[PDB]
Amino acid sequence: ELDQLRQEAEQLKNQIRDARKACADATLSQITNNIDPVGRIQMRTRRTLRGHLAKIYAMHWGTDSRLLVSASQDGKLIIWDSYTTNKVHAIPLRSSWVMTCAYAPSGNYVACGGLDNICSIYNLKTREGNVRVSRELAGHTGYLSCCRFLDDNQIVTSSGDTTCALWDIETGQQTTTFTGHTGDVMSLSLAPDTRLFVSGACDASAKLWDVREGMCRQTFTGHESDINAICFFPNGNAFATGSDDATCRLFDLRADQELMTYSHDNIICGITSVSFSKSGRLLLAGYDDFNCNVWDALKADRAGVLAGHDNRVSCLGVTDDGMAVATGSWDSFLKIWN
């Protein structure tokens, strides 16, 4: 049955390339060409948030802006105030390697966990002005790479054991497990509908999981290296993906095909973080060559360079309303641009 399985699978996949290629009739570059260029948009650094002692690995804007939380190798999950550049909390962690960070959509809880194999939940507001751990989610067998909040009572985690699992923080027990990945996954971006999410593994592939039925539905390929970051389009129809081959791609969930791709011969480093603006015309991205290029989402023409950092940019996030960008680096300095 082994040979039969192999031949059937390879014939089906040969058919599926034909099915994908049949849908193609043109390219989005040709379709949009007749649009005026974006211009020479320029960003000037406004404020710098200092106080960290090591390399920031993550940050996450709040729900109504004005707040952002960052995690470092020191073991401090500092919570800043984005208007007065002041600090509100200095929660000391137990493990000194955290690679994830997630502010709750309601503003009550924070989650943070790295090489400890355990995801922890912190309760900000209590009867007194003290922050203490509320639960410690355990059951994984590898380093945590991403975790996002689905609501006040559900959390989705992505770990290094090539499995993605959904938890439920009232008893600390798993609910659904998403299996099917070969390499480790290091990117977990939710959707505005809060019903679908994608994962980007190291096998140069991506899948579209369903939170309601718990099985894969879409398989996306086209890269030649591991996936470092991923992020949906504001509309909810496409996502951007970054790799280590200095290439950015905009896949589609409707036609199940790779759309127009970004590239530039003067860049040889690897993408570290990708996110969209509010409208969906600017696509900021990080790089290992100490800057943060800003692409055009339609015509692929560089519209500026967000340089000013001293080391690698590790993470960045655009605020909800759209009046703020922030980039974290190994320089131990957060920089909130405009």
Added chain:
Amino acid sequence: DVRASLYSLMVLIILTTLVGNLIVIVSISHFKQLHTPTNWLIHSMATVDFLLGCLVMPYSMVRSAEHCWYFGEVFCKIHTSTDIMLSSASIFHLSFISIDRYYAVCDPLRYKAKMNILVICVMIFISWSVPAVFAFGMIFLELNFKGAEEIYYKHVHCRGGCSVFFSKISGVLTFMTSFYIPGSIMLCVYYRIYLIAKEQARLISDANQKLQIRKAVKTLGIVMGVFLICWCPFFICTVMDPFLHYIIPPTLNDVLIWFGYLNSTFNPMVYAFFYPWFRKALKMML
């Protein structure tokens, strides 16, 4: 004629020292990746050299040029006190840099816990304070000649430029407070560092030679040779003059005092521009 060439070389010295010190100051201040406490000592030394280039050397230049003092006695006193303060500041900064390197390369484990910014700030304060009090006390409180007055009035019987007069006690006091102690400390520290570096280099060379089938002397030698050649003769002549009957022509004295300036010129090319990381940062500025 001779005077025109003299002006050419001297103004070349002032311009080059100002340019070097300003470049070092700007490079240390502007960049953020160079903020370790040792660079603060280097920057303080650079500012001392910049002030020494901006204040005193034009007037010394003109004095030595025409051998006459077209100024006032109070201005001369200010000039002398400033010169004495700004030379001792540089010497003390060199000694403190030597002590810093000694702690760096002799106690590697407890290096970042004993060379915090507080200690460096105290070092800079004690480097700037003591020379000032010492010089102003010696000059304004008429203490350099207080021991003997007949010799001083013989000294002012002739010439007419304001040359610095040192008694038999004031001379030895200046010698054993601004040259001897820092020199001895630098000698001992650099000799110990040389021994340690030689031992480690020999072990590494032996290991790599066995598995295969002198920067220390070139680095410490430059610093020590520059410092000794630029400072020693002046202080030897200065201390020996009071014991003799002042039979030394000023033709030696002007060269001796200009050697100190030349040393102040040659500081940022031995302490800043000689290491690779500083050049890398400067290129990254471009």
Added chain:
Amino acid sequence: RNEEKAQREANKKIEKQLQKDKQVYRATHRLLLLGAGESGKNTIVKQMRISGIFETKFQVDKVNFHMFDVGAQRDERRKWIQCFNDVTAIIFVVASSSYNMVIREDNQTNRLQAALKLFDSIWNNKWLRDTSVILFLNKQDLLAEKVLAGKSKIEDYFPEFARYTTPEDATPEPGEDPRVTRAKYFIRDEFLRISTASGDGRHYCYPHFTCSVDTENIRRVFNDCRDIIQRMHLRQYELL
């Protein structure tokens, strides 16, 4: 206003705490403890004491060391290794009395060959290109008992043993038996050859002979860290 004063006071408290934490953080050195599962990492860690990282904090000569058991992770592609690019040294425990013993996977080769492959991968990693390796070698008495009591010899599993002579640096201070020191110094040769092929004076390798239970391991780590940091400082000022 009164709202601003509370925020400023909280910021002052946070900064005051962070100053103390900064003062504490500069006086600790970080060390990794890569090694094989069957090797005596657990015994050494327990001795230093007297489900991922099991960080242990010990102290010797008024300085604090910070050591990490990272054996819970999986194998291949080793992508967590990027973070440990600021540590001082990588302790590497290897059991020498395993030339005959085979890992649970029968298809897999001898444990010593796997240890050599892991050492090669760690040494030639591009991220770990500026950190030394403090190589240990445990299970010393077991190797002696194995070699003295006849049984299968090294030549069966290691063919090149025949073309070997004891080096001129061997110092058998206990003076137990010359047939054991030959194998003991043979074991070092593979790791030294792996270490000497690369180089150019950026990271070194300090081999050692020790048992699981005996003392002086902390002293050895202390001395090796002192030497590593001293050479690192010496090479900045263009002295070495």
Added chain:
Amino acid sequence: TASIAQARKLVEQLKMEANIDRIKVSKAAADLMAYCEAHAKEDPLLTPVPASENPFRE
């Protein structure tokens, strides 16, 4: 065997993957471009606002 069973499961997953509806890339591109001016009026980032609304003034 167990490996054969998991391979069969992967084949079933692939066959479930293949039986999905598709669409022309042109329509998706048109929808994306239309949305690219539908909400582009806001553009707090693409179109700079006067320095009186931004809470991040110097």
